[PDB]
């Protein structure tokens, strides 16, 4: 019957904005624009966002609020045959929390390393340096910048590792930072959305404060317009390319994050008659708007480097951790009052991750709380166990070969693996459960049914624009490599298991509960195609 709701409505929005807005809104989207032709990239981006991303973002939020249950229980009550999806979805979210939280730890490490008069990554004369160290980014892989060597040879001590087979010693400064991360995550998700929804007031909003400050500091610097030019310049030649629409898609999907069961879990605490259609639209926009804004934040500073610091643009324009932990701090160090810009930046990165991590965790806790009554009342004790598992196993990310472990999970934990989950999320709703039955559900809530636009998107466009991008990513697949290091053939297979162990739950739990229920022939499917009420 009655489950707790959001202490306030803003708590929900900030939770969803917070979860959606993450480090990829910073270190991925702006890179994609620069790579894919600038404001021209917004067209496949916008399209994929409009037809693929927002409808599935909207779909998840609607489902959560309507069925009032976590990821697992929701799909059990929706399409009992496909209940495996809820397992896949949660288990995916389980894998990402292993992987994602260490990024926050890096941010906190850089933060704790930012209390000083002179930032350690400015020069090449430190002990961790190599004779090949140059002041800023370059071309030849053999010669790293000062920030690259600080990150790799000091913070990570990745130089001390020969691959994922050798993790080496554990960094106890990093293990400390990772612990601090899981401490913050615990006491946010401790008592549930009572505290959680209040905590995201900081973690979701704070980056916008820092973004603005860096936006102004960024645009107030020489050569800032040049960076914006590299960022937004409309080369439409990339639209014709296949992998650009693939990039525009996977980003849109990963940025909004349906299929992690986060939107499901977060919405399950909404009041039934709340208008979730305006929430999904409001959140979709703000998330993408933040990516657009951060684009200026990154590239205004990226342009400043190609002007005053005498570096080539393709070297400093980077995705992933490389951008925020190496390239951007390298710039900060040069400009006046650097220590301030550093402290807020790394705190931004942490607060970009946390609320995103809150969601992933909540997706798991809520899903498990609704499934097993031995969870919900015990929640204080459960999240302790979960994060203890996260920490202990996560110590592998704090090793000297920690990045190699991170980078592996980065690719295989979620991935196109989330796309097949979301693809099965769309097919189950639109076809098995049905759109006419789903539109009717939303009508009862918000007062009006979704336009035919959303329905076609859920029924036709999104599955199509999912299926074919997840296929074109398999043909464009190549073995995992970081820098000069090539992961062994067995490391690839381990990642596939990680990517597989989730997705296989969809056919496995299907087959299992298909053999489990009494019946025969056709109508065995009726039992598993009839929803919770029917």
């Amino acid at each position: 019957d009655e489950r707790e709701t959001w202490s306030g409505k803003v708590d929900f929005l900030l939770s969803v904005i917070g979860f959606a807005v993450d480090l990829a809104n910073v270190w991925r989207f702006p890179y994609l624009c620069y790579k894919n032709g600038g404001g021209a990239f917004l067209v496949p981006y916008g399209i994929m966002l409009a037809v693929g991303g927002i409808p599935l973002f909207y779909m998840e939020l609607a489902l959560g609020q309507h069925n009032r249950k976590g990821a697992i229980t929701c799909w059990g009550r929706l399409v009992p045959l496909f209940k495996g999806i809820g397992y896949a979805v949660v288990l995916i979210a389980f894998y990402v929390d292993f992987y994602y939280n260490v990024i926050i730890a890096w941010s906190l490490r850089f933060f704790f390393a930012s209390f000083t008069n002179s930032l350690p990554w400015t020069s090449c004369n430190n002990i961790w340096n190599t004779p090949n160290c140059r002041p800023f980014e370059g071309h030849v892989e053999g010669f790293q910048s000062a920030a690259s060597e600080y990150f790799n040879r000091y913070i990570l001590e990745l130089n001390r590792s020969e691959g994922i087979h050798d993790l080496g010693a554990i960094k106890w400064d990093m293990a400390l930072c990772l612990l601090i991360v899981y401490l913050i995550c615990y006491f946010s998700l401790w008592k549930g959305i009572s505290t959680s929804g209040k905590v995201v007031w900081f973690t979701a909003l704070f980056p916008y404060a820092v973004l603005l400050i860096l936006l102004i500091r960024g645009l107030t610097l020489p050569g800032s317009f040049l960076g914006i030019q590299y960022y937004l310049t409309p080369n439409f030649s990339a639209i014709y390319k296949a992998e650009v629409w693939v990039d525009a898609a996977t980003q849109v999907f990963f940025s909004l994050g349906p299929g992690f069961g986060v939107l499901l879990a977060y919405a399950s605490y909404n009041k039934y008659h709340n208008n979730v259609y305006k929430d999904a639209l409001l959140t979709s926009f703000i998330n993408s708007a933040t990516s657009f804004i951060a684009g200026f934040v990154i590239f205004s500073v990226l342009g400043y480097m190609a002007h005053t610091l005498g570096v080539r643009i393709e070297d400093v324009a980077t995705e992933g951790p490389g951008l925020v932990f190496v390239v951007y701090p390298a710039a900060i160090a040069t400009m006046p009052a650097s220590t301030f810009w550093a402290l807020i930046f790394f705190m931004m990165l942490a607060t970009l991750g946390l609320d995103s991590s809150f969601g992933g965790s909540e997706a798991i806790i809520t899903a498990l709380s609704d499934e097993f009554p031995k969870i919900k009342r015990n929640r204080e004790l459960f999240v302790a166990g979960l994060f203890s598992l996260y920490f202990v196993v996560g110590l592998a990310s704090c090793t000297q070969g920690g990045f190699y472990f991170f980078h592996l999970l980065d690719r295989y934990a979620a991935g196109y693996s989330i796309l097949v989950a979301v693809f099965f999320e769309a097919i189950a709703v639109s076809w098995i459960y049905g759109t006419n039955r789903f539109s009717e559900d939303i009508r009862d809530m918000i007062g009006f049914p979704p336009g035919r636009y959303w329905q076609v998107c859920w029924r036709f466009v999104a599955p199509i624009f999912l299926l074919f991008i997840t296929v074109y990513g398999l043909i464009g697949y190549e073995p995992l490599t970081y820098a000069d290091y090539v992961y062994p053939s067995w490391a690839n297979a381990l990642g596939w298991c990680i990517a597989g162990s989730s997705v296989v739950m969809i056919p496995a739990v299907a087959i299992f509960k298909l053999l489990s229920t009494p019946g025969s022939l056709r109508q065995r499917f009726t039992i598993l195609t009839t929803p919770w009420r029917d």
Epitope: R437, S439, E440, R443, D444, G447, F448, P449, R533
Partner: antibody, heavy 119, light 109 residues
Framework: EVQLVESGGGLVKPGGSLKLSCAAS????????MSWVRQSPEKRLEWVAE????????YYSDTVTGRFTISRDNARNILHLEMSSLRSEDTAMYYC????????????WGQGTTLTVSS | ENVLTQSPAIMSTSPGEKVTMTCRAS???????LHWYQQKSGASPKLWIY???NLASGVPARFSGSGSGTSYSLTISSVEAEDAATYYC?????????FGSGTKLEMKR
């Protein structure tokens, strides 16, 4: 275009039972929620019951609740209201009113059929 | 239930004059969920104004709605003999759905 035709209705002994039907035409019937709004001889409009597009969501006014049963045939495009233990205060003109959108109200009404409950 | 009361009960007006009728709710009604219906003598009600300011199809521009919260109003800028009818407001915000007591607009001669 859109036509709603109420049928049935007439004299019924108090405590008696009667079933009203509405013939919907000119629109996809399965796509819209339907409601019964009755108008007393005092011309007071009272919403009786609402059925959703799929018949899976039902609401009743506290007046008719448990006595009246609103059902739906999407195959034959017919809306039903099944009445039982009818009382003299149930005497009114029963309207078949369509609207799906709560924010748009009832955009189409029938000619109405008349129920008289008296001994 | 949420009871909507309308005033005046009966209203007489000469063609061309402005009329305003009011609809008051016991509980607050979302501006999006409040609607108005016109019912001519011996005829079915017709959707007239929906979502408080929005005229329905066929409805002349002379009609306008306004208001929010517990207080709403229908206003005919210049009345025609064609406009003599009984006007009911309504709320869809919650259940049971309720109709206003209604305003009978009659022509003054």
């Amino acid at each position: 275009e859109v036509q709603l035709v109420e049928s049935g209705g007439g004299l019924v002994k108090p405590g008696g039972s009667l079933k009203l039907s509405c013939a919907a035409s000119g629109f996809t019937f399965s796509s819209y929620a339907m409601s019964w709004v009755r108008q007393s001889p005092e011309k007071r409009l009272e919403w009786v019951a609402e059925i959703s597009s799929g018949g899976r969501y039902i609401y009743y006014s506290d007046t008719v609740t448990g006595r009246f049963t609103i059902s739906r045939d999407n195959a034959r495009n017919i809306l039903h209201l099944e009445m039982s233990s009818l009382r003299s205060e149930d005497t009114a003109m029963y309207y078949c009113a369509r609207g799906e959108v709560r924010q748009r109200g009832f955009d189409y009404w029938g000619q109405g059929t008349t129920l008289t409950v008296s001994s | 239930e949420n009871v909507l009361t309308q005033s005046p009960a009966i209203m007489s007006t000469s063609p061309g004059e402005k009329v305003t009728m009011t609809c008051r709710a016991s509980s607050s009604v979302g501006s999006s969920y409040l609607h108005w219906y016109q019912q001519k003598s011996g005829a079915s009600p017709k959707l007239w104004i929906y979502s408080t300011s929005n005229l329905a199809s066929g409805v002349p521009a002379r009609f306008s709605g306004s208001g929010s919260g517990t207080s709403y109003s229908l206003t005919i800028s210049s009345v025609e003999a064609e406009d003599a009818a009984t006007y009911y407001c309504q709320q869809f915000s919650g259940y049971p759905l309720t109709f206003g007591s209604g305003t009978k607009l009659e022509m003054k001669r």
